[PDB]
Amino acid sequence: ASTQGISEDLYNRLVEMATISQAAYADLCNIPSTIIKGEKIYNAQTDINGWILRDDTSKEIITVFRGTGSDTNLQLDTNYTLTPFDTLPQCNDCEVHGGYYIGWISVQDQVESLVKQQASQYPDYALTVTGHSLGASMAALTAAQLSATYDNVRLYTFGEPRSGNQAFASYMNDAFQVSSPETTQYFRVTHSNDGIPNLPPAEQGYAHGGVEYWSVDPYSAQNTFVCTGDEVQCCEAQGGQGVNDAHTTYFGMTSGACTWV
Numbered sequence: 001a002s003t004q005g006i007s008e009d010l011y012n013r014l015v016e017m018a019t020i021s022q023a024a025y026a027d028l029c030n031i032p033s034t035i036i037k038g039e040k041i042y043n044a045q046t047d048i049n050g051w052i053l054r055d056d057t058s059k060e061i062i063t064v065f066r067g068t069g070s071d072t073n074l075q076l077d078t079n080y081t082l083t084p085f086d087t088l089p090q091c092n093d094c095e096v097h098g099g100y101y102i103g104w105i106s107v108q109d110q111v112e113s114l115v116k117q118q119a120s121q122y123p124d125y126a127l128t129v130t131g132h133s134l135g136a137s138m139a140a141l142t143a144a145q146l147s148a149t150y151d152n153v154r155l156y157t158f159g160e161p162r163s164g165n166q167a168f169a170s171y172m173n174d175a176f177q178v179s180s181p182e183t184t185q186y187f188r189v190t191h192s193n194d195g196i197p198n199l200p201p202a203e204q205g206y207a208h209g210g211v212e213y214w215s216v217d218p219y220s221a222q223n224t225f226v227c228t229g230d231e232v233q234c235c236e237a238q239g240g241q242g243v244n245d246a247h248t249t250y251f252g253m254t255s256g257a258c259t260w261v
C-alpha cells in the first residue's frame, strides 16, 4: 500500500529524530531539552562521527550517527561491493554495503561498550538508533547488532541508502515487526525525490527493509504516506539522481544548519 496521512503523535516523533540526525553535523546544536548528551563516538581512519544520548522522560538510550561530512566518508559511500555481515552469524546469507561495513567495524567496540554501560545502569530503558544518509546506514547496521543483544530496540532513518541484500532486509523486517505499520519498530523516512534511497541500484543485489514514511512537499502529517510491500512506489518511484536538494532537507531542516528551536 501507499496510504495517505499519519497521526500527529507519530509526525512529532519523526520530526524529533530528524532534528537529532541533522544536528549531528554541527556538534548537536539545539537538540531537545529532554536529552542528556553522553560520550562522543569517533574513528580517525573512516571519519565516522556519532554520540550516545539519554532521554529520561521517554526512557530511551539514543545512538546517533552523522552522515557524509568529508572526502573520506565519500570514499566509503561509493564502495558498493557486498560483504558478509559476520557481526551476526545467525543472519543467514546476509550481506551489507561494503563501505558502510568498514565504517561500522571502525566504531563497533566504542558503540557496544558505551551502550552496555548505559543499559547496565538503566536496564528498563529502550534502545533507539538514528541518522541521515551515510549515518542512516550506520544506524541500520548498529540496530541489527543491538536487536540480537537487547529488548526494545527501535530504528529511525532519514534518506537511507539500500544498506544490504534481501536476506539482510528480511532479517530486519522480522526483528523490527515490520509486517504491520501498527507494530513496526523500523521507520524508514524518505523525502520527495531524494536520490540516495535509489543507491546502490536494486539490480546489483541490494534491497530496503522497514516501513517507508514518504514526506511529500509541503511537509506535514496529512502529506506523509505509509508505504509497504514490493511495488516500486513512493520515493523510489520518483527516480531522483544522487545527492540532490531533496536529500539535504528533511521536515524543513538542512543538515548542520541549526535553524530549528
Ligand SMILES: *[C@@H]1O[C@H](CO)[C@@H](O)[C@H](O)[C@H]1NC(C)=O
Binding pocket: 079, 081, 083, 097, 098, 099, 101, 102
Ligand atoms: C570495500 O569494503 C570491503 C569491506 O566491507 C573491503 O573488503 C573492500 O576491500 C573494499 N573495497 C575497496 C576498493 O577498498
Ligand SMILES: COc1cc(/C=C/C(=O)O)ccc1O
Binding pocket: 067, 068, 077, 078, 132, 133, 134, 135, 161, 162, 196, 199, 200, 243
Ligand atoms: C550509496 O551511494 C551513495 C551515498 C552517498 C551519501 C551521501 C551523504 O551521506 O550525504 C553519496 C554518494 C553515493 O553514491
Ligand SMILES: COc1cc(/C=C/C(=O)O)ccc1O
Binding pocket: 216, 217, 218, 223
Ligand atoms: C500547494 O499547497 C499544498 C499542496 C498539497 C498537496 C499534497 C499532495 O498532492 O500530496 C498539500 C497542502 C498544501 O498546502
